[PDB]
């Protein structure tokens, strides 16, 4: 679940 995109 602990997602982790750009930025």
């Given at each position: 679940?602990?997602?982790?995109?750009l930025?």
């Amino acid at each position: 679940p602990t997602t982790t995109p750009l930025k």
